[PDB]
């Protein structure tokens with residue numbers, strides 16, 4: 001089983017290649033990490049195993065879900081440190097995913113009910129609805145297209161959040177540039193209708209993610225920085241006319257950032273020759289594949305060299321010992337979609353049984 005051959009992910013030595021994918025669970029009440037999160041990640045932590053936390057707010061305007069953790073206040077760093085210690089006390093490596101939803105927000109999630117910010121003024125179409133704090137579903141509003149000065153301010157929010165994560169004890173961070181959120185709103189030409197230096201050509205549309213990665217790399221180091229993208233996922237109207245060309249353009253800038261920094265990024269994380277094999281071959285460094293992978297598909301991806309690590313999402317919600325179950329080829333538990341985003345600290349969160 002190649003999933004349990006060790007792997008060197010920069011400075012971190014992993015004992016297996018099963019990774020916990022980032023998953024918003026909405027148990028961080030009032031954007032403050034709770035003790036339930038520490039129990040949740042501890043259940044899933046393994047000695048030498050890699051964990052990626054739920055998307056974490058970088059600023060008061062970055063949230064589009066209820067009760068998602070932040071890492072932009074000192075109270076948030078204080079609470080995150082207790083969760084990181086418990087995870088580290090089981091021998092695991094943990095990255096904090098920095099997450100800005102962009103236009104994928106709503107009045108109720110914004111300070112003073114302000115409009116969400118984005119690369120464009122176009123809202124997410126009527127086909128998608130946002131989850132509201134009371135469990136209902138609302139309408140995505142018109143975002144406010146930000147200028148270039150505000151862009152550099154959002155980049156500074158990524159930078160300050162990356163330092164706060166290291167302050168909390170995180171081994172590193174992952175840049176959330178997937179699933180049609182703020183960074184994807186600049187990447188995809190189905191959303192980015194700008195005419196300034198951040199829109200139009202592939203180079204202009206890759207400029208925002210390039211500045212975000214360079215800023216956090218300069219702050220904490222490249223080997224503590226992971227990047228996640230999803231060129232071929234159309235979530236929230238995040239379509240590109242050429243997802244392969246866009247994905248290869250992003251890899252080219254990531255490869256260049258590593259050359260200009262003298263170090264490799266922690267990894268490239270792609271969720272969805274296959275599109276995934278093409279980006280892996282083009283990227284000079286560690287590759288994590290994500291999306292619909294099983295035990296056999298993950299074994300095969302590592303054996304054929306398609307990826308170095310495999311992240312599992314939904315199966316990790318219902319199987320806290322998913323790493324052990326994959327090792328023993330033990331039957332897995334079903335997950336309950338109803339409690340994906342509820343607020344109970346136990347029900348549908350930490351009460352999924354171990355083997």
Ligand SMILES: Cc1cc2nc3c(=O)[nH]c(=O)nc-3n(C[C@H](O)[C@H](O)[C@H](O)COP(=O)(O)O)c2cc1C
Nearest residue numbers: 021022023024054055271291292293312313314340
């Ligand atoms: C409830 C839920 C929350 C998720 N939250 C995030 C997130 O915050 N950031 C992210 O990049 N992906 C998020 N994802 C996507 C997963 O990380 C993963 O890419 C996707 O679930 C496919 O993995 P799987 O088929 O193994 O479940 C989430 C998925 C689910 C089901």
